[PDB]
Amino acid sequence: TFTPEQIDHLGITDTNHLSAASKRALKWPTDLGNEWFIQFGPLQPLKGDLAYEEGVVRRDPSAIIKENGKYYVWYSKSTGPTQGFGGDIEKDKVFPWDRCDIWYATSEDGWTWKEEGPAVTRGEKGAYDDRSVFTVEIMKWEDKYYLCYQTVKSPYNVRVKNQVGLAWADSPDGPWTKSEEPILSPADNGVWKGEEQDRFAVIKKGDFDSHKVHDPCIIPYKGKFYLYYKGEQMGEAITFGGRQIRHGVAIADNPKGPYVKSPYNPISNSGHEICVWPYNGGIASLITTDGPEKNTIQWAPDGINFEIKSVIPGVNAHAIGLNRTADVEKEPTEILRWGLTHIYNNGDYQSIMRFSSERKTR
Amino acid sequence: VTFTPEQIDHLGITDTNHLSAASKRALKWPTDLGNEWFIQFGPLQPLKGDLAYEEGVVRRDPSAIIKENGKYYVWYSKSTGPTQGFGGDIEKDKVFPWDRCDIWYATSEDGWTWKEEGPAVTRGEKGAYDDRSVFTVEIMKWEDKYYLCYQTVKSPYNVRVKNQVGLAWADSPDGPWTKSEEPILSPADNGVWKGEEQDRFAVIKKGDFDSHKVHDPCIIPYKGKFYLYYKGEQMGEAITFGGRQIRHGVAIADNPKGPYVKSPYNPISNSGHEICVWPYNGGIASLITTDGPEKNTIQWAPDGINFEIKSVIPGVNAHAIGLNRTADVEKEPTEILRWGLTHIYNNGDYQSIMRFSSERKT
Ligand SMILES: [Cl-]
Ligand SMILES: [Cl-]
Ligand SMILES: [Zn+2]
Ligand SMILES: [Zn+2]
C-alpha cells in the first residue's frame, strides 16, 4: 500500500521495484510529524557549588521543581577516589556512586547553584541502605514531597542486588523521613553460578530485572503512582543492539506503596537511564544508550504501550534530570528545552552540567 | 503476533498474556541475528605532517585508502579561505567549505604522518561541467588502472544547482589523471522548483530521492559489473520524525567508464548520509550515519540492493569515512572498520582529515 503523495515524500523511484529499505520506509506512520525530533546543544558547566570540585562526586541529578522562588535539585554526592572491585570490598569505594548520600541544591536562575545540605543519608550498619543511597528522583503529591532512590546493603559486591528506598517531607528543604522497608527490589528468580564475583556467570538469568532496579522515577498518573525503572539482568547479554537492558514499571494506589510490577514488563525493549514525563494524557520516554531502539523518543497513551515518535542523533546529555517547571503540555519536547545532566570529568570525579535542546527548523 | 519459548526467554519477556507494545516490536527482530556487527567507535585522532589541522585550509571527505609503492595513498577535497555562504555574490564567493575545491592526495607509511603530494584532479575550464568545484572523491583500483569518481559543480554554485559526478583515471596512483569528457551520473530530472527565489525547500513536486544532488560517489566492483553507490538529496527535502530526509541509491555499469544506469530499486536506503560501503560475504555492507530513522546502523544486502539492519550502534562520530581497502575485509563483518580516515569540523570554515578506530564490544 502507498499514495502518490507518500511516494513523492519518500523519493521512491519505482513502485514496481521496491527495495527492502523502501518497504520499511512505507511502514512508517504518515501522520507522524517532526515535532518529537530534537537536537542537543553543547553541555554547559554550572556555577556556585555545582561547578566541578576535585575530590567530590556530584552526579545523577533528579528532576528540577520550583518552590519558594527557587529551583531545587537532588543528587548523589560522595568523596574520595574509586578503587573498583579488585581489592577489599568492605573497605573500598567500588563505583563513584558507592559511599553516597543524597544532597540537594537551589538556584534562582538555574545556573548558579547553592548546595544546601544532605537530604537523605545512609542508614545504620546492617540496614538495607547502609552502604550507599544514590540515584534519586523527586515527585510531589498533595503538598508532600517524595524522593525515591537506589540503596545498597553492604558489601557492595559485583553480585549485590540494589533496592529502591523512598523518603518523604513536608518541605522541599526536608527534613526527610525514610521508609523502614525498600519499595522495590529486583526479581527473585536468577541463580548465580559458582562463587566468583561475576555478574555474567549464571545457572538461570531470571527476569529482565533479576540483578538491578535502577533510576527509579515516580509519575503520579491516572490516580495511581507509576514507578518507572531500569532493570539489569543477571547474565546480561550483548545483542545486535548492544547491552540488553529494558525498562519496567510498578504501579501503587498510594505514594508510599505497595508498588506492584506490571504484568506488561518490560515496557521497553531498549534504553538505559529513565527519563519520562506525562504528556497529553499519556507518558513520554527518552530511550538512550543501549539497545536497538536507543536514541528514540517514545510515547504511550496508557503509560504502558510505547510507540516510537522520533529517532534523534546520539544524545550527549546522559541521566537527564528533567525541567518539571516547564510548560510540559505546550509541545511534546517542551520539557527538554533545558535541564540538568552530568559529565565524566574523569574516572573518580563527575559533576552536574546543564543542557539545552531544540527542534530542528529548515 | 507469534513467539517461541526461546524468543520469550532471549527477550526477557515476563508474561505472554500481557505483551507490551515494545515487547511485540522485539518479537519482530530476526531471531538468528547475532551480535557480531555491533561496534563502538573510539575518539577521533589527529593526523601529523600535512594533514594536521591547518588554519586557512579545508582538507576533507577522505577517499578510501589503498597501498601502492610502499605507502598508503588518500585523495580529498582541498580548498582555501573563509566560506561566505549564499547571501552575497554567488559568482565570486565561496558558498560551502567544499566550494572552490580541487582533489589533492597524500601518502604515508604508517597511516599517521601524511605528506601532501599535489593536485590529482582540478576544476575544468570556464564553462565546463566541472569548472566550479571538484570534490568528495572515492578511489577504485581495477585491472592495473586507478579511477577517481567525485562530485562536480558547474558555475554558478546557486542553492538550486544540481551537482553531477565526474570520473578520472590513471595508470599510476600519482597520476596524471584523465577526466571523463562528460559526467557519469546526474540527479533525477523529475522535481519541479516553486518560485524564483533560491530556496531548495520550495517545490511543486519533490521528485525522486536524488532530484537535487548525487553525492559521495563510491564504486564497488561487484558481480563482474561496477556498482556506484551514492547519497541523493531531494528537491523540497523535509525534516521528518527521523530528521533530514536522505537516502542512498546505486547505479550500475558493465565497465568502469560507464554507462552507469540507476537501479529501478532506488533508493536502496531510507536514511544515511556519506556513503561508506564495502563488499562482504558475496553481498554489500553499508554504514548508515547522521540522518534518518535508520541512522547509526550497519546494514547488509546479499545482492547489493535489499539491505537489512545487522546492528544498531552508538551515535557514530566518524562521518564521511574513507575505508581501509587494504584491510582483510572478508575476515569478519566489521574487520574493515578497525581503523580508517574521516574528518572533523574545526570551525565552520575549516575542516581536517582525522583517523578513527572501532572495536567489537566485549
Ligand atoms: Cl547497583
Ligand atoms: Cl553540491
Ligand atoms: Zn537520574
Ligand atoms: Zn567520502
Ligand 1 being an ion, which residues bring their Cβ within 5 A of it?
A 162
A209-240 b/e (C-beta count within 10 Å ≥ 16 → b)? bbbbbbbbbbbebeeebbbbbbbbbbbbebbb
Shortest Cα–Cα distance, A233 to chain B (Å) = 9
Q: Which experiment gave this structure? A: X-ray
What phi, psi does A19 have (nearest 5°)? -75, 165
A240–B33: do the CB atoms touch at under 8 Å? yes
Q: What count of residues does chain A have?
A: 362
Of A231, A226, A246, A127, the residue nearest A187 (C-alpha): A231
Domains of chain A listed by start with CATH number: 1-362 (2.115.10.20)
Q: Please list, in sequence order, all residues whose beta carbon lies within 8 angstroms of the beta carbon of residue A43, skipping any fewer than 6 positions away.
A: A316, A317, A341, A343, A353, A354, A355
Compute how many other C-beta atoms are within 10 angstroms of the C-beta atom of residue A99. Answer: 21
Which residue is listed with cell 537511564? A273
C-alpha cell at A337: 528545552
H or E element that contains B218: strand B213-222
What is the rounded CA–CA span in Å between residue A31 and residue A34?
10
CB A212 within 8 A of CB A232: yes
Report the largest interatomic distance among the alpha carbons of chain B, rounded to a whole angstrom: 71
Of A211, A261, A216, the residue nearest A237 (C-alpha): A211
Looking from the CA of B68 toward its CB, the CA atoms found within 13 Å total 18
CB B7 within 8 A of CB B280: no
A240–B26: do the CB atoms touch at under 8 Å? no
B206–A238: do the CB atoms touch at under 8 Å? no
Q: Please list, in sequence order, all residues whose beta carbon lies within 8 angstroms of the beta carbon of residue B84, skipping any fewer than 6 positions away.
A: B93, B94, B95
Shortest Cα–Cα distance, B55 to chain A (Å) = 23
Q: Which residues of A touch B361 (CB under 8 A)?
A: 238, 242
- The DSSP symbol for A56 reads E
How far does the centroid of ligand 4 lie from the alpha carbon of residue B136, in Å?
6
Of A187, A196, A145, A189, the residue nearest A163 (C-alpha): A187
Of B233, B261, B236, the residue nearest B247 (C-alpha): B233
Q: Which residues of B touch A289 (CB under 8 A)?
A: 314
What is the rounded CA–CA span in Å between residue B275 and residue B25?
29
Q: Please list, in sequence order, all residues whose beta carbon lies within 8 angstroms of the beta carbon of residue B253, skipping any fewer than 6 positions away.
A: B184, B225, B226, B228, B259, B260, B261
Report the largest interatomic distance among the alpha carbons of chain A, rounded to a whole angstrom: 71
Looking from the CA of B59 toward its CB, the CA atoms found within 13 Å total 28
What phi, psi does A6 have (nearest 5°)? -60, -45
A328 SS3 class: helix
B241–A309: do the CB atoms touch at under 8 Å? yes
What is the rounded CA–CA span in Å between residue B279 and residue B312?
20
CB A233 within 8 A of CB A211: yes
Compute how many other C-beta atoms are within 10 angstroms of the C-beta atom of residue B291. Answer: 22
Which residue is listed with cell 585522532? B45
Q: Please list, in sequence order, all residues whose beta carbon lies within 8 angstroms of the beta carbon of residue A89, skipping any fewer than 6 positions away.
A: A155, A156, A157
- Sheet with B283-288, edge to edge strand ranges: B277-280, B283-288, B297-301, B308-312
Resolution reading in Å: 2.0
∠ CA(A266), CA(A271), CA(A274), 5° rounding?
A: 85
H or E element that contains B24: helix B21-27
Burial of A1 (0-12, 13-18, 19+ CB in 10 A): exposed
CB B118 within 8 A of CB B104: yes
Q: Which residues of A touch B301 (CB under 8 A)?
A: 20
What phi, psi does A92 have (nearest 5°)? -80, 170
Q: Which residues of B touch A3 (CB under 8 A)?
A: none
CB B129 within 8 A of CB B166: yes
∠ CA(B65), CA(B270), CA(A356), 5° rounding?
A: 85
Q: Please tell me which residue of chain A has the smallest CA distance to B27.
A: A269
Beta-strand (E) ranges in B273-318? 277-280, 283-288, 297-301, 308-312
Q: Which residues of B touch A361 (CB under 8 A)?
A: 239
β-strand partners of B192: B205
Beta-strand (E) ranges in B98-144? 102-108, 113-121, 133-142
C-alpha cell at A155: 558489601
Q: Please tell me which residue of chain A has the smallest CA distance to B212.
A: A11
Task: Considering every ligand atom shown, identify the ligand nearest to the alpha carbon of residue B77 and give its number.
Answer: 4
